[PDB]
Symmetry: C3
């Protein structure tokens, strides 16, 4: 019935890097074509960009977007997507059994990214390509002019270099489904050598080495150790990927999965510091969580599409329609990312448009709308800039089918000194009981209580209406904040 946590600006975890509110666009399904890019459409500007989609993206305040993959990158040749569009080829995309027309490449996406106030985090091909191709691409993007590839950029219409800050050394080459799959030694060596080379061209960039595809890989976490062992001195991040599903329809146990996310993260941190010791390095590797989401709804329609319909352009792949319970887990995951903001400095909601996304457009030019998961993300990114405090919290527990001793309440406070606000992100994953949260704020006035609630866990949004949306509802006296947390609710409580 009652949950208690104390909140104190003295007891810090770290400052939030806004890059943990990043996302990701891959050349996959309708992410780009019949998605962000629809040339002759009434809602499309000059570049063919859906204006209504741009607006929705600015709503989430996404500062950084991974691109262009994803499995797609492991067999992509970046030259195919630049220069005169007339001379760009159509390629088989082996990852997703599609045809890539390459009408959107590095320059097109680059300008899309300005329009939504983001910048690229670039992936390079290390599956079928290597060191020299990574160098060409880096030079093309970051070198100012008067060398072969910088002049090639300039000639292609882009006078100023994109100056891309963060680059990813390939993509998840641990899996048997990946083109150019590598062993940990193989990938370790190619990543170390690519990183060494790229740093000679531009010392100011940052580099992400690939972690395991998931914690469930037999090579997790030795992959990470081995890869960091080779590449430590030349790279700045290790990558982490996690996705969750409710195919077993067990909402209580589903909502408990952020606890495993916490465990996953710690394991990866521990693996980092192990190698840190090994190298007697003073540098900390930070975590890049460059693929996280809920993902299960559309697995079967994806199966029908390959084969039976291979080599289509822009097939409707990975189009999960999200529920209310899904949006709760997303909220729980953001909360977990925040509690680890000392080590996690980049995270990417996978993905941004149509493909497991919080922003859908209909098909053949449809209207565009917010999925359920759009909202806990919007709150996180908007009120979540500042300083994370340690969640000292005693809260009721419960068991689920496959998880023991799971907290009913999961919460984090983040303090914004420059605004004199303290936002409490809180989720009641007790699916049945309501709970009152008593918050001894060793402060330092209440500003609002924003809530995401619904009686139907399986309810969805659609092109027709929103159902799940932030309601400014509810319900603080001395320096004690007391707030009722509805069973199965996402809460965002502010102070002034």
């Amino acid at each position: 019935k009652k949950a208690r946590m104390t909140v104190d600006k003295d007891y810090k975890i770290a400052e939030i890097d806004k890059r943990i509110y990043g996302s990701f666009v891959e050349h996959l399904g309708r992410a780009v074509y019949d998605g962000l890019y629809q040339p002759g459409n009434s809602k499309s500007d000059e570049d063919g960009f859906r204006k209504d989609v741009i607006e929705l993206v600015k709503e989430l305040n996404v500062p950084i977007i991974a691109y262009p993959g994803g499995n797609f990158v492991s067999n992509y040749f970046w030259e195919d997507g630049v220069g005169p569009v007339e001379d760009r080829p159509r390629r088989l995309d082996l990852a997703w059994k599609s045809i890539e027309p390459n009408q959107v490449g590095i320059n097109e996406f680059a300008k899309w990214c300005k329009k939504v106030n983001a910048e690229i985090m670039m992936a390079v091909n290390l599956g079928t390509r290597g060191i020299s191709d990574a160098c060409n691409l880096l030079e093309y993007c970051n070198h100012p002019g008067g060398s072969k590839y910088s002049d090639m950029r300039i000639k292609h219409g882009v006078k100023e270099p994109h100056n891309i800050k963060v680059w990813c050394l390939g993509n998840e080459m641990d899996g048997p489904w990946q083109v150019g799959h590598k062993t940990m030694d193989e990938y370790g060596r190619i990543a170390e050598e690519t990183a060494r080379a790229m740093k000679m061209i531009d010392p100011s960039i940052e580099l992400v080495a690939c972690g395991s595809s998931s914690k469930d890989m037999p090579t997790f976490p030795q992959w990470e150790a081995t890869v960091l062992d080779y590449a430590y001195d030349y790279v700045d991040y290790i990558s982490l990927h996690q996705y969750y599903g409710n195919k077993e329809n067990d909402t209580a146990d589903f909502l408990a999965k952020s606890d495993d996310l916490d465990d996953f993260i710690r394991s990866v941190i521990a693996t980092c510091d192990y190698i840190k010791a090994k190298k007697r390095s003073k540098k900390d590797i930070y975590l890049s969580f460059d693929e996280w989401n809920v993902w299960y709804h559309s697995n079967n329609e994806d199966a029908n599409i390959m084969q039976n319909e291979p080599w289509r352009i822009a097939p409707p792949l990975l189009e999960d329609i999200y529920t209310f319970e899904d949006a709760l887990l997303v909220g729980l995951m953001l909360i977990t990312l925040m509690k680890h903001a000392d080590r996690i400095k980049i995270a990417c909601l996978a993905q941004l448009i149509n493909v497991i996304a919080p922003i859908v457009t209909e098909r053949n030019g449809g209207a565009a709308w917010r999925q359920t998961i759009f909202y806990p993300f919007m709150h996180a990114s908007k009120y979540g800039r500042g300083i994370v405090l340690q969640p000292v919290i005693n809260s009721p527990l419960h068991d689920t089918s496959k998880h023991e001793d799971v907290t009913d309440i999961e919460s984090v406070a983040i303090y914004n000194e420059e605004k004199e606000e303290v936002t409490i992100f809180a989720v009641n994953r007790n699916i049945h009981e309501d709970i009152v949260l008593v918050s001894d704020v060793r402060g330092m006035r209440l500003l609002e209580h924003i809530v995401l609630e619904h009686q139907d866990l399986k309810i969805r949004n659609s092109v027709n209406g929103e159902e799940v949306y932030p309601k400014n509802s509810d319900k603080f006296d001395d320096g004690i904040l007391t707030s009722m947390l509805r069973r199965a609710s996402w809460n965002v409580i502010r102070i002034g």
Copy 2:
């Protein structure tokens, strides 16, 4: 004197996969240039192909043909053999120290294969190239259209895809002679990854991983075990390569070497069976014997030309001239191949034209004639479709100088249900003593007893007419259920039933 074996239609081994009667053209010596392809000559059609040669290949009923190598492929760049011929470059072929003009390539050789009723089994360059190059070549050949490398094929004269069904992941890279030689681990990994990628482009293809260059390689059979442990889930075949020679001038020993062939095959099957258990797989790896033949005659002259006359176009390399004893071993090898039809599904006589070949054209315009070895391969290919039946044979035995307990008679029956025939292939490796074969056939009339005999083991053929050729002879005779055939000492025998 007495040979007893017993046919039985109910006692089967396997259905013959017609791809055990495949062959192989490498861009080597006179195989293509001044061989199957002579653009000026009077016997050559509108494309430039010797039609006499085309007619001879058809005689052999060769369903499948390896191309373009062989050692040649390890440093080949396929793009050089396609597009406008005026814009194709000439290349050093390191394999054979020769200049490759590339006037024949892929699209040209795929036309040739249509005309001989054959398909291409394509090798890819894995010596100095890798995954993405294998990917482009597959897309160019097998993808219908609407993408860079398919649209490219179309632009080059070929509207429909070749849809090539079997691919070889590189060529024999364990050897210190091979350009881009790999260790078993390097090859295993490149083979696994190349196969993984290709199957994403076209799931209908089948793939062959390279075995050892020979059973005599010190890394055999660990090579095979290792390469399969890597690529098991993405490949369908492992290769075997075997050649024999009679430099010792011992004929009875020479014909006995098909026992060594049997052992080689069983070893590879045991190796596959072991990895299968290791992987707990329900799949059996099958055997592609994509290089076999007798080879030895031209060894001296072959070295002479490299390197004392290097970088010629189409030098006369590997032009073994075949004798009659060679033809018996080739016949025995085919029998051994057939006997293992339950695991060997592809096999290639190496090679088809000029180069250790059954077919020859002379030089600078040729003439075209059949070598001794042409004939057993012809019979095998023609009457050897259907079901191999289990050979229960009690044969007299005989030692030789380097082998023990070698059967005098080596025999196999193949039953075609669609014709209600039952062909019986037998070789009498008893070089001295004629022997009769008592065939108790639980059938089931007699149709013929084609034979291959000559009194001179060292006798050859030439452009000036045969010498060794099939004679519709014997001395056969079939009563109720029993066939009793006299098998002349040192003979090949094709005995049919109606």
Copy 3:
């Protein structure tokens, strides 16, 4: 005070191979641009080559020049430096943080080598490139005509192939500063396979496998043992690099570092002989000492240029101005090389022009002059062709700050049977006392005694004139030669 040494033509070491008087030119600094190559300068020919430079090179009688690297080659694309000069790209050089314009490449350098009476020793990129690309270049250079790359060379304006005799299999890839850094196994495999392929195009070439970058690399000499274990049957040499410096300002210790060189050579020989036994080969590997010099003076200045001032064309890197003590050590090194002429068959003074060089041109059209180190090399190269005689020598010893039992006199005799002369090379590493050399010659008239001496060990040369030049000074009888060797001096004593 007393030093003796016996000299017996029956007691030989080896015939000297002129290729130990080789040198090296890298696309580094002003070595080429504003060095050997200066297009429309009054001192240059039609082709753009500085004629006075050309003459100075000839004075050193250099039979062989390594080209074009050096760290530079490891990310060099040879096709960039050939064909129509208007169509050659400008490339980033990652090794030296410079822009390489590629006006000079292969064909231009092949004809400069003619004018200086020298053959090229060609290095191939084995950093970002591999087997096929090394084949192409060899075909381009050595195959007469009738193939893609041979014909290409003919089209570019060179009808007869350069027919390059020696090739280096990459450069220094054992070091973390090199683009395309390889492990000893990675490199062993790649050198082996590249060697195998190249020898199929041209069996008459010789190949050098890369040894360790220096004897202080943690992987020396295991790198040598390993690489040779792979590539023995296809290569002819193992490379050695060594460079000495005097930042300690310890002129006596510094002059003893030719003893660490001697020890370095011996270890590389032992390693070769080890693998030889392992292979049961009847072939010996020879040593190619393709980088040796003094190098330390310009270290701080080099750092200042890269970075905070990078991507310049022809920046003034590695421009050491050599002292007199510096000249003494070169002579010491030469003598040490000479003592090992039975296994060392190629050595390259690094480098020829401007870059840690004996030959300098001023800057922007400059002037051209000789450094101190020019002369010991010049003498060694001129009077050093013949047959090396075992140094049977009893010399006073001295200890130094870091070297015990250093010889006071280092010396060798070489006997040119054709000219009926016997040259003795000698250094007095004892910078204080003047020693006398009683040279028993089981001969067999004294021709001259050349000397290189100076009162100030730190004196330099400069464009304004030479403070250090050979003086025909000094100071024989029965068959016993006696000469006084001034403290801290280079001596060339001759006989007819």
